């Protein structure tokens, strides 16, 4: 999914990257042990690939 500005003012955006404390959540909710997110812009961009950390 995506968005770009139409308002012509500047924008401030927030998001999160889930780290369960156990795997049974991870398989139950999302059904992949693989994590891969890619939050992308022109200037900034970054990916996220976590595991469970107790």
């Amino acid at each position, epitope marked *: 999914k995506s968005y770009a500005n139409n308002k012509e003012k500047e924008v401030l955006v927030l998001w999160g990257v889930h780290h369960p404390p*156990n795997i*049974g*959540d991870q398989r139950a909710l999302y059904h992949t042990e693989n994590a891969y997110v890619s939050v992308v812009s022109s200037h900034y961009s970054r990916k996220f690939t976590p595991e469970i950390a107790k």
Partner: single-chain antibody
Amino acid sequence: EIVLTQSPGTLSLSPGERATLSCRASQSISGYYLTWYQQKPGQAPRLLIYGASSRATGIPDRFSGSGSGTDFTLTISRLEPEDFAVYYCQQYGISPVITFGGGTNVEIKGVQLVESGGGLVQPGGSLRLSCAASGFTFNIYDMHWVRQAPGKGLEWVSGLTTGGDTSYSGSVRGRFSISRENAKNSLYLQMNNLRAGDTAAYFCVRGVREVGATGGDPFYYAMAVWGQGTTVTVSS
């Protein structure tokens, strides 16, 4: 949420036998969406199967199911006289409404909650029930109050998520009112305008781990655990 239909509401079969039971709905409804129970008359219900395949804790291997979409199914590998019981079919609506099959008797041929206040009122009257918790964190789980007439199909009276989204039936709503207390580890159900449709045995029920907490509890979209229930009646 959708009307279900079990298949059959009672059956009579011999030992050393399978038993196929089909709970199917109006619409096609996606499959990690149901769970499956038993109950002995006099005992509270017990949890067996969830999501049309997968199996609960403290178990043999014999009860096993299948099916998808509109037609969900639980089958049985072996029948035994210790299974002499009514089995149920309980589904979490996307409209957050549990819906119930009408119970299925197997006849074989030859931690806890605690309820509070069950009993009599006058019809058109007013009465409250409470429940209370023991040995867990009543914080987390989405709770449900449930009813049952004797040897009848269940009905789901009400339930509430821990962030306040209520769900009732359109008939029962307004006449009942709930309220929850996690610091108390207890629950309340104030009730008014009571007629013979309420003449039934009720149950308090702990359901669903909401998203997040420490624990060695996983979650399903099944119940967690029941209570022993209690009788409530109008009369004169």
